[PDB]
Write a protein that binds this ligand. Structure first.
Ligand SMILES: *[C@@H]1O[C@H](CO)[C@@H](O)[C@H](O)[C@H]1O[C@@H]1O[C@@H](C)[C@H](O)[C@@H](O)[C@H]1O
Ligand SMILES: *[C@H]1O[C@H](CO)[C@@H](O)[C@H](O)[C@@H]1O
Ligand SMILES: *[C@H]1C[C@H](N)[C@@H](OC)[C@H](C)O1
Ligand SMILES: [Cl-]
Length: 7
């Protein structure tokens, strides 16, 4: 990953 969220 490396980004975040939450979707
Ligand atoms: C997500 O990132 C925030 C900001 O740094 C941090 O406070 C949370 O603990 C962190 O969540 C962790 O990492 C994610 C990728 C997992 O889905 C979540 O369950 C928790 O382990
Ligand atoms: C979850 O999915 C969305 C839609 O593709 C992305 O924008 C996001 O960075 C993550 O991959
Ligand atoms: C992260 C927080 C967000 N409110 C949620 O959407 C329902 C997602 C599943 O997790
Ligand atoms: Cl998510």
């Amino acid at each position: 990953x490396x980004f975040x969220x939450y979707x």
